[PDB]
């Protein structure tokens with residue numbers, strides 16, 4: 001409908017209207033019955049972010065469920081751009097991907113775009129982008145995925161994605177690249193080629209693909225669906241989440257560009273405290289999105305704050321408690337993840353199959 | 362000065378003035394001094410295409426000899442785009458690279474751009490280029506390179522060049538790509554990226570690179586030289602050859618687009634006969650002998666005078682040309698069959714090939 005905010009795979013500016021964005025991008029709203037269809041098919045309760053509609057939009061999700069119950073299955077694909085340390089917003093797609101692999105028992109491909117973040121950022125060198133890649137793996141593997149149904153790879157290392165991208169790189173016209181991603185005459189040739197690389201993992205299997213991500217990554221999936229059939233694959237399915245807002249603002253997105261308003265997965269308990277205490281509804285947004293896994297306590301405390309039974313200080317003390325408990329658990333797992341990197345990258349069942357794409361010798 | 366002919370890495374149209382092309386591309390002429398300088402260091406006589414100045418232009422070639430003389434050495438790189446069968450023009454760069462590897466004893470990297478040819482040709486599929494890749498390898502191995510100092514790879518297979526291309530894929534902005542290669546809004550994104558892939562093999566070693574090829578491939582190299590030092594490498598050296606003309610026409614070059622005027626490395630003796638005999642056509646007849654076929658300088662000059670002065674009939678000259686083409690092709694096709702066994706060595710098992718493939722992470 002209206003134009004005053006920006007949502008690209010690299011920028012999110014201004015107050016985001018998710019209802020308009022659903023039409024701007026042409027994505028289907030994740031209906032109430034589609035959520036209940038998953039609950040009855042997996043025979044379990046949906047996680048916090050699904051039932052509270054943090055994931056608001058979808059593409060061919062009804063097709064994914066139809067494929068599963070008819071026994072032809074599917075596979076999961078999500079990714080991460082290692083431009084620096086990860087925050088709470090970056091990890092939610094992976095938690096959604098964890099639950100989906102858990103309940104449906106499907107393969108998972110995780111793309112670490114260390115090539116992208118070198119190409120798209122001037123400050124960063126290719127060397128330190130590979131550094132953050134490893135650091136980011138640790139956080140991702142700390143979520144807990146099936147060691148035999150998951151493949152985590154870097155584009156610079158598992159360079160087979162280049163060969164996997166060439167088909168679509170011949171399909172994607174350059175005029176339409178500039179149109180979808182806003183490339184200009186001043187973009188780098190590596191920048192212009194990259195969309196082929198991010199689309200490539202959808203062709204890991206002949207089965208249909210599901211991509212749990214935030215709405216900002218959608219432009220890639222539109223182009224995929226434009227040429228999927230002519231390349232002999234299914235039009236990729238997607239589940240789109242909203243954005244985790246920053247502390248001070250509601251007119252943007254939690255970004256590492258503003259470290260003061262972002263809680264990193266690697267943040268200390270003192271860092272959490274200092275960031276929340278220091279300023280001044282955002283407080284309950286985070287609890288609704290990720291941190292309070294109880295609906296009754298969420299509902300009761302919100303109205304206890306809205307009407308004024310709870311003081312502001314006691315209210316954000318409760319936020320700190322929740323995000324401190326999660327970070328303590330995550331950082332503990334990070335240390336345990338260090339000795340599982342080889343499994344998810346090389347040694348594991350899926351990882352071994354994929355790496356057996358090196359010429360027989 | 363003048364541009365009423367087109368020379369891009371994908372098309373050559375019209376009669377080509379090689380003198381102006383040196384100015385247009387900013388290359389430097391291969392001086393008579395440099396030819397004799399190489400003969401001293403190599404301690405031998407120069408090949409037909411070198412001494413008869415078929416290779417006419419160069420870049421930093423004086424710096425490639427200085428490095429060898431001062432004991433720090435260099436390395437060779439050339440390539441081939443597998444769109445179909447290879448003709449006689451395609452193989453000359455490889456013969457030059459053979460001689461340079463022989464006399465200088467350096468490493469050789471051969472890039473088979475089966476990715477380029479799929480992207481740039483609408484009619485070709487990725488499988489087409491992959492199988493034409495194998496076919497072309499046989500012809501390239503048939504030339505005879507050091508089995509331990511040569512690596513022949515395919516961009517779709519040795520996908521390591523993608524990681525080798527990223528650094529310069531961030532340097533070369535899109536405005537530059539259009540200006541150098543003539544890309545338009547109708548180009549495919551894979552086309553626009555590709556120059557990074559063809560430049561990448563110049564970063565195989567820290568030593569400086571020499572590229573023996575025809576002048577049409579030069580746009581890639583002058584773009585490599587713009588960013589080589591900022592990426593921590595030497596700006597690549599090059600040796601540029603002229604084009605082998607087609608049978609009938611004096612404009613353009615020998616191309617697979619017109620198979621009837623091209624001598625393919627796979628052509629039978631009767632194919633050569635029919636192609637030469639069939640058309641009325643005479644500079645071309647002796648151009649080929651000057652640049653590739655007649656290894657004797659004294660015999661070459663003698664028959665040129667005997668032809669132009671009318672002492673020998675054209676029928677004798679065409680018969681003389683055919684016999685020399687047939688001698689080469691009989692010998693090449695013989696070595697081509699023996700080449701089928703050496704493929705695994707040049708691609709994987711060989712000393713250099715094994716070193717490069719050890720970029721499959723420790724597992």
Ligand SMILES: Nc1ncnc2c1ncn2[C@@H]1O[C@H](COP(=O)(O)OC(=O)[C@@H](N)Cc2c[nH]c3ccccc23)[C@@H](O)[C@H]1O
Pocket residue numbers: 009077078079080081082088089090091092093111112113116198211212213214215216217241242243244245253254255
């Ligand atoms: N503030 C936020 N709130 C909620 N979710 C957010 C927030 N910020 C980011 N996300 C989602 O987190 C994932 C990683 O973001 P990246 O920017 O690294 O995402 C990137 O840099 C990609 N180019 C890397 C990539 C490659 N393949 C993929 C497939 C799916 C998703 C991502 C990828 C993404 O799912 C993103 O949608």
Ligand SMILES: Nc1ncnc2c1ncn2[C@@H]1O[C@H](COP(=O)(O)OC(=O)[C@@H](N)Cc2c[nH]c3ccccc23)[C@@H](O)[C@H]1O
Pocket residue numbers: 370438439440441442443450451452453454472474477559572573574575576577578602603604605606614615616
């Ligand atoms: N009519 C002719 N007369 C004499 N030489 C000719 C003639 N036509 C072509 N050549 C030379 O043959 C080699 C391969 O040609 P391609 O078109 O496959 O060339 C191609 O398609 C490249 N994209 C493949 C490539 C990748 N890296 C390289 C490095 C050097 C040279 C070539 C490459 C080239 O040396 C070319 O200069």
